Amino acid sequence: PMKLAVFTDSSAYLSAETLQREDLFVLDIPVNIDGEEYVEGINLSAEEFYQKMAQASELPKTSQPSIAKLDEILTSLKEQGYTHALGLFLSSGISGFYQSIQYMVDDYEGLTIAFPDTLITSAPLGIMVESVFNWRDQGDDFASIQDKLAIQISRTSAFIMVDDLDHLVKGGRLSNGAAILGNLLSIKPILYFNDQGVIEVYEKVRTEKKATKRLIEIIKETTASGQYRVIVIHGNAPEKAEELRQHLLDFGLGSDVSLATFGSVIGTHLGAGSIALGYIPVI
Numbered sequence: 169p170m171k172l173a174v175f176t177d178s179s180a181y182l183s184a185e186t187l188q189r190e191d192l193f194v195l196d197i198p199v200n201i202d203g204e205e206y207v208e209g210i211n212l213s214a215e216e217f218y219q220k221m222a223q224a225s226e227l228p229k230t231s232q233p234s235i236a237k238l239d240e241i242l243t244s245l246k247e248q249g250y251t252h253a254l255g256l257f258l259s260s261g262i263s264g265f266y267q268s269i270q271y272m273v274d275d276y277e278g279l280t281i282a283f284p285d286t287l288i289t290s291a292p293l294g295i296m297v298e299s300v301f302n303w304r305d306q307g308d309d310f311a312s313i314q315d316k317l318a319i320q321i322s323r324t325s326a327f328i329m330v331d332d333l334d335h336l337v338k339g340g341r342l343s344n345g346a347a348i349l350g351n352l353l354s355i356k357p358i359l360y361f362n363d364q365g366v367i368e369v370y371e372k373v374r375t376e377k378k379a380t381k382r383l384i385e386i387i388k389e390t391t392a393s394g395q396y397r398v399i400v401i402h403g404n405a406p407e408k409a410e411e412l413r414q415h416l417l418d419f420g421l422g423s424d425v426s427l428a429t430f431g432s433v434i435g436t437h438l439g440a441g442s443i444a445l446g447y448i449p450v451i
């Protein structure tokens with residue numbers, strides 16, 4: 169008789185079905201712009217965010233989700249009837265949140281808690297959350313859900329292109345960003361999430377048009393051996409996203425092609441004009 173709660177954070181891109189789940193708890197990630205604190209969905213929209221960021225004197229800054237809030241929810245979970253909790257948070261490679269909460273797994277009597285490192289964010293992370301609920305609805309036990317998540321995590325990644333590397337370098341998430349930035353200004357680098365969940369240069373490509381072709385070739389090879397969802401994700405780049413989506417459809421790549429967007433949390437770090445292809449097994 170497992171009664172399961174699922175946690176994630178607002179860096180995940182969540183479907184309408186998932187957002188309505190009664191056992192889902194989402195931790196907000198605040199964004200500070202020139203000293204003013206915003207939380208998307210409370211006092212900020214994604215459209216407003218890109219206008220504020222373009223106007224701001226300094227780059228926005230994100231903060232980790234609140235460990236105090238997570239504790240507040242976990243402390244009430246037993247009294248709500250829960251026996252298990254699964255936390256699917258943004259990659260340990262892009263935020264210190266994951267490491268800072270590891271103490272919690274044995275801190276709540278009567279609750280079995282697991283925090284797998286997802287090594288991702290955005291739409292693949294939201295698909296992991298949705299998958300957990302679908303597997304639970306299919307009758308999987310806790311250990312089986314953990315195993316299926318591990319399979320997804322092992323075969324999930326994303327390939328990214330940005331208009332301005334300043335957000336990734338000054339925000340600190342591009343591996344070695346400050347040391348390598350000088351050599352990236354004359355080309356269009358393709359970034360990716362490596363096997364440690366860290367954003368790093370995958371390939372240097374001389375033109376944006378050749379980089380776009382490489383994105384398609386990469387996704388074709390990484391998803392060729394099984395059933396994958398591919399997501400075209402953009403931050404204020406809807407024309408480029410539609411072109412990339414159509415290209416994947418013209419060549420029959422992936423078992424599922426969809427669109428998503430970057431809001432305040434990830435747009436702070438990628439900047440406007442960003443595009444990514446994420447992929448994750450269907451299971």
Ligand SMILES: CCCCCCCCCCCCCCCC(=O)O
Binds near residue numbers: 179289290437446
């Ligand atoms: C499918 C992946 C698409 C590309 C994802 C790019 C992510 C860029 C880095 C985002 C870091 C956000 C950190 C928020 C919490 C914190 O400040 O610690």
